[PDB]
Design a binder for this molecule. Sequence first.
Ligand SMILES: Nc1ncnc2c1ncn2[C@@H]1O[C@H](COP(=O)(O)OP(=O)(O)O)[C@@H](O)[C@H]1O
Length: 328
Amino acid sequence: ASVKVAVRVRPFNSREMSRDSKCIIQMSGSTTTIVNPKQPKETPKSFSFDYSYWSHTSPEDINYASQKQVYRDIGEEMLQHAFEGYNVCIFAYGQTGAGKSYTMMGKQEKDQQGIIPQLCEDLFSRINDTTNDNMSYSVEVSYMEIYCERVRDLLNPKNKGNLRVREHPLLGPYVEDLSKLAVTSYNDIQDLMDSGNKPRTVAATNMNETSSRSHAVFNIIFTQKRHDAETNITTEKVSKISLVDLAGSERANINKSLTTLGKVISALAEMDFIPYRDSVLTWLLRENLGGNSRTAMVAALSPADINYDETLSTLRYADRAKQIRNTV
Ligand SMILES: Nc1ncnc2c1ncn2[C@@H]1O[C@H](COP(=O)(O)OP(=O)(O)O)[C@@H](O)[C@H]1O
């Protein structure tokens, strides 16, 4: 199953408006076109993706791509696979301030909530709508940050241990002693999500906002138990959902995981060895990038002329990822 890829351009932001930036991005169907502001004499480069989301204007536009479309397209599709019994993964990629957090977390208001909130909500809604008493559920969550190769429990900032990433001799990679909490309602999960968001590492270089060098991985362990009065054995289906918000693509080493992710994606796109263990990110996400899992990428794009190089680079790496195929 191919890694599905979407790209999304946001409206100008303060930095761009202050330099009178023009828009160098265009979309139509599933195709995204980028113009080169420095060399207007060349022909615009175009890429095609599963989805090319135009969110450059405002929800008052008939053509604005809303947090709801985005989720109903890729988010919903993955949740359904999770229910099928498939592990899934969605990660946001892009230059700092491109729109990664907004797309993944968004803002809890004006129906401005991103993929994570909507998926969690959608998930409990479905669970509570079950009418077959032979089915019972379990939902566990974990939330971590990876900053400079260091892993931190975001749901338990009451422990400074930089959790160690271990390779289980038989079951794969796992963060040692990372808290896994049972949640029985959307409100509860959303509270953990909220506290977790504040625990994230900040940086003075970012005006003390969340460091553009931290990766956040939100995981859900969805267990389905199906019982039937007969032989009396309850069968179990366990799906792991990984929702990832990555550090800026160009915003014990600072950029190891991101550079390594790039190599792993290129390698995988070419292949169809891979340096998974070269970084904690690619190591933990090994099975989501080539392994047994349905996966998707959402690449955030700045629409500004001043970010051409970084945006072209994001489009290129997104184009690559489109060629990856996992073995599920
Ligand atoms: N689709 C969108 N609709 C509206 N505003 C957006 C959209 N994408 C990005 N933005 C705006 O851009 C800013 C930066 O996106 P953000 O998610 O914070 O950055 P990053 O990619 O570094 O995580 C936000 O403060 C938000 O107001």
